[PDB]
Every structure is written in structure tokens, then in C-alpha cells.
Scaffold this motif. Structure first.
Motif, PDB file in Angstrom:
ATOM      1  N   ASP A 215       0.930  -1.144   0.009  1.00 42.06           N
ATOM      2  CA  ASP A 215      -0.254   0.042   0.034  1.00 42.06           C
ATOM      3  C   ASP A 215       0.847   1.302   0.033  1.00 42.06           C
ATOM      4  O   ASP A 215       0.624   2.072   0.570  1.00 42.06           O
ATOM      5  N   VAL A 216       2.082   1.263  -0.766  1.00 41.85           N
ATOM      6  CA  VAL A 216       2.760   2.408  -1.096  1.00 41.85           C
ATOM      7  C   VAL A 216       2.112   3.216  -1.976  1.00 41.85           C
ATOM      8  O   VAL A 216       1.470   2.692  -2.796  1.00 41.85           O
ATOM      9  N   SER A 217       2.040   4.646  -1.904  1.00 39.48           N
ATOM     10  CA  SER A 217       1.073   5.463  -2.911  1.00 39.48           C
ATOM     11  C   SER A 217       2.039   5.674  -4.183  1.00 39.48           C
ATOM     12  O   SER A 217       3.146   5.440  -3.942  1.00 39.48           O
ATOM     13  N   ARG A 218       1.355   5.836  -5.279  1.00 39.88           N
ATOM     14  CA  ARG A 218       1.887   5.610  -6.506  1.00 39.88           C
ATOM     15  C   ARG A 218       2.996   6.653  -6.666  1.00 39.88           C
ATOM     16  O   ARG A 218       4.183   6.634  -6.968  1.00 39.88           O
ATOM     17  N   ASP A 219       2.599   7.892  -6.032  1.00 45.29           N
ATOM     18  CA  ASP A 219       3.551   9.165  -5.955  1.00 45.29           C
ATOM     19  C   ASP A 219       4.884   8.939  -5.139  1.00 45.29           C
ATOM     20  O   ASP A 219       5.729   9.354  -5.365  1.00 45.29           O
ATOM     21  N   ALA A 220       4.591   8.376  -3.864  1.00 47.93           N
ATOM     22  CA  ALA A 220       5.752   8.173  -2.991  1.00 47.93           C
ATOM     23  C   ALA A 220       6.684   6.873  -3.793  1.00 47.93           C
ATOM     24  O   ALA A 220       7.959   7.289  -3.617  1.00 47.93           O
ATOM     25  N   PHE A 221       5.927   6.059  -4.386  1.00 43.82           N
ATOM     26  CA  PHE A 221       7.103   5.242  -5.024  1.00 43.82           C
ATOM     27  C   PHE A 221       7.927   5.773  -6.230  1.00 43.82           C
ATOM     28  O   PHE A 221       9.073   5.401  -6.314  1.00 43.82           O
TER      29      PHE A 221
END
Length: 230
Positions: A104-110
Motif C-alpha cells: 500500500d505504497v502510494s504511487r507518487d511515493a514510489f
């Protein structure tokens, strides 16, 4: 007659590379199969443009060739691919260790994490030179194929849902270091996802748990395996 353990590396690592201490401690006791994903190490296949799909198909062929076993998947390459192998091919996997990884990492974090690799060869010539030796010159092409695939389709490549880990039908351990807060919380929160997911936090370790704190990495996996495979 002996069980087999498969070791799947993270981005631009190698089977033997990320897992050197693990192979030394467990070979002789287990069949250890360090896997080099497409475009990495000694792997005969270069990276494909739909990298994760191709890499999962390569990983599936590996286990189907050498028989069902224990999967260790590290970082946001091995982790997701190992989990998808355990989710889509439970017939091939007896248990799963996910390590240096957070659901559940946010796409923008990743994608912001992936940005760290932008211009790597220009900014870290020493690291770039080891990559050429480990991988061949193709590592530049490999990095582009991987980053590109996550850019188009984060959800079906690097993203793993905690709910999807709970739905796994095999014993699962989330084994992370304490240093990266997102990984520590995942390892702490894993037992509450609603399956039999086990979590363990390794002190003094960061993203590469198996390399940072080898001694306690192997013990946590061994402990886990004794409960899972007895």
C-alpha cells in the motif's frame, strides 16, 4: 528429498549478490537457487518492456523447473514478483518471505523513490562501473525497462495490497529492517492484515535486511520455516 529455497533480488541486484550470506548459511542444508531476473547478472534473458509480466513468467518457469519451494523476495522487484508468484501459483510455493518491502505504497511515493535512480550512471560512476561488471552494459537498458513499466502501470507491477497478502494461501513472513519507517510499520502491522501473515522487525537493519544484519536475518527466516514447514 530436501526442500528448496528461491532467492529473488531487488532492482539491479543479483541472486548471489543480495543473498551471499544466506546462500553460505543454508546451502548444504537446503537447495538454494539464487535467481537472476531478466536483464540482471548472468541471466540469459535481457529485460522486456513489460518487465514485471515477463520477469514473473521467468520466475514461474524457474520454480516449475526445479520444483516447488520456499520463496524469499526482496525490495520492490523481488517482493512484488514473489508475492504474485505465491498468489497465482500456490502450487509452486510452500512459503513466502517478503523483505525490505511495504504494501500500500502510494504511487507518487514510489515513483519518487524510482527518481533516485535518474542519472545514476552520471552521478555515481563507481556504482555504474560495478553494474557493468555484474550485469553487462545492458543494465542501463534494464533500469529503463523496469522504471518504464512501473510508470505505466504502478498498480499491477510494484503495488501489493496488504489485503492481497492476507489472501495468500501459504505461510507468509514480512521481514523488514527498523530503519525505514514505512518498512518497520509494515512488519509491525502485518499480523493485523487478517490472515496468518507473520511480521518481524530486524534491529539495526535498513532496506537490505539480509545484507545489513545477516545473522539475525537467517534466524528469523529459520524460526519462521520451523513453524511453517513442520
Amino acid at each position: 528429498e530436501t526442500p528448496t529455497v528461491y532467492l529473488v533480488h531487488g532492482l539491479l541486484g543479483t541472486g548471489h549478490g543480495h543473498f551471499a550470506a544466506q546462500i553460505r548459511a543454508w546451502h548444504g542444508r537446503l537447495r538454494t537457487v539464487p535467481v537472476d531476473l531478466p536483464g540482471h547478472g548472468r541471466c540469459r534473458r535481457d529485460a522486456a518492456e513489460d518487465y514485471f509480466d515477463d520477469a514473473l513468467r521467468y520466475l514461474v518457469a524457474v520454480l516449475e523447473r526445479f520444483g516447488p519451494g520456499r520463496l524469499i523476495g526482496a525490495s520492490y522487484l523481488g517482493g512484488p514478483l514473489a508475492h504474485r508468484c505465491a498468489a497465482t501459483r500456490p502450487d509452486l510455493v510452500s512459503s513466502l518471505v517478503l523483505t525490505g518491502f511495504a504494501p500500500d505504497v502510494s504511487r507518487d511515493a514510489f515513483l519518487s523513490l524510482i527518481a533516485g535512480f535518474e542519472g545514476l550512471a552520471a552521478q555515481q560512476p563507481a556504482l555504474a562501473a560495478e553494474y557493468e561488471q555484474l550485469h553487462g552494459t545492458r543494465w542501463k537498458r534494464t533500469l529503463d525497462a523496469v522504471t518504464g513499466h512501473v510508470e505505466r502501470d504502478f498498480e499491477r507491477t510494484a503495488l501489493v495490497r496488504a489485503a492481497d497478502v492476507a489472501a495468500l494461501t501459504v505461510p507468509t513472513l514480512v521481514l523488514n529492517g527498523s530503519l525505514k519507517s514505512v518498512e518497520r510499520a509494515a512488519a509491525e502491522q502485518a499480523p493485523g492484515w487478517g490472515g496468518r501473515v507473520r511480521g518481524r522487525v530486524v534491529p539495526g537493519a535498513g532496506h537490505l535486511v539480509g545484507h545489513d544484519r545477516p545473522r539475525e536475518f537467517n534466524e528469523a527466516v529459520e524460526d519462521f520455516w520451523r513453524t511453517a514447514h513442520d
